[PDB]
């Protein structure tokens, strides 16, 4: 029955993925026809700003569908692949690359309260890229400075990212999380952190901009 | 700790599923952004250059996609809530309520549902919510398209249960029989048989559409029995 349960859980998941790859094939059915259509028009007639725009909007859609497949598969990679990991070990490189990128922009990143050997359970690549996006995003709004701080209590780690940028109005605070924001978006992070039983909140930064608060629970055996 | 390690994995996959629920509804919301840009692009090209077989085709493929995005946005809301648990279950317990609500809905429409061959205490292993909503959609369908009557029949052998749903409605042409199972497919949301086909194939069973002796469409669900 251990095998029976394993085989059952595999089929729950493979069927979810089948349904998704079948929706994407059905969305691509007219999309490929559209792309074949522009291709024939491009050869028959000339190239134009309009035809260029139609062709790039077609790619933009196919890319989104392609992200939907991958990001779905990755959420499975994330639930099945997980381990006990220390706060300082996990995000040290993240903060080091980020410190260098600020130095290049002429800006200054400061880790006032550094992470310690604090137990976390979960996908390391997921949590690595979670803070990485918040930190890349804080390098955008910020005029000159960014500040990262780590806190720990009996319940969990609290990561706080602050910028001296323009920030966000009280109304827009709750509505700062949706994808394809033009890192990628900020809803990837919300999903990623809620996947690890944590939460994310946006606030007024004492620096003048926006304060991003990531909370994750500590790992207890 | 033998089952404590299972709960933890189940809870993880539960959170994994609800995160894939969100991701889908968010992609679908974002898909109308480039589509409108594409439609304003063809519109300007129609104005600049002339009208052509190509431009006509691109414009109709854009509509076809828009429709799908709408269907995807509706079947983003009302997601398949609280699934993922497989268990041993008896056929009669499983679909009793399904057939009872369905018998009442027919009575309201002035139509008549008949369970000629009822389900028995037959062993099944799998997600109950998945199998309940599988037949539920097939009967939802058969209630809508039928003119006056619907017939449900259960059969069992050493290999498995065979559920047959028949309606006196218009039915489907020989060509569209397999096509009605595809996502967004409609003969004229189209995600009904898409979901049923997945739910059955998941339980290593099968679904087929045929000519009904009642005059409409015959839907055949075959599931295997659970052996201890
Ligand atoms: N009982 C039926 N009789 C005739 N046509 C049917 C029947 N059931 C389904 N169809 C056709 O197959 C299509 C696909 O079915 P389905 O996936 O369940 O979509 P929907 O959610 O609109 O019912 C329907 O839109 C309809 O054209």
Numbering used by the authors:
A (entry chain B): 224 to 405, 418 to 456
B (entry chain A): 220 to 407, 417 to 456
Show the paper's wording.
Here we report crystal structures of the full cytoplasmic region of CpxA, a prototypical HK involved in Escherichia coli response to envelope stress. The full cytoplasmic region of E. coli CpxA (CpxAHDC), encompassing the HAMP signaling domain (residues 188–237) and the DHp and CA domains of the catalytic core (residues 238–457), has been produced as recombinant protein for structural studies. The CpxAHDC structure consists of a homodimer, in which the HAMP and DHp domains from both subunits assemble into an elongated central coiled-coil region flanked on either side by the two CA domains.
The 3D structures of wild-type CpxAHDC (or the point mutant CpxAHDC_M228V) in complex with nucleotides have been determined in five distinct crystalline environments using either single-wavelength anomalous diffraction (SAD) or molecular replacement methods. The 3D structure of CpxAHDC is highly asymmetric, not only by a different orientation of the CA domains, but also as a consequence of two potential bending points in the central helix α2. When considering together all CpxAHDC crystal structures, it transpires that the DHp helical bending promotes a strikingly different dynamic behavior of the two CA domains in the homodimer, primarily due to distinct interactions with the central four-helix bundle. Thus, whereas one CA domain (from subunit A) is retained in a fixed—inactive—conformation close to the DHp helices (α2 from subunit B and α3 from subunit A) through a relatively large contact interface (∼1,200 Å2), the other CA domain with apparent unrestrained mobility adopts disparate orientations and displays significantly smaller CA–DHp surface contact areas, the largest of which (∼800 Å2) corresponds to the autophosphorylating Michaelis complex (see below). In all homodimers, the fixed CA domain is sequestered by the DHp domain in an inactive kinase conformation, with the ATP-γP positioned far away from the phosphorylatable His248.
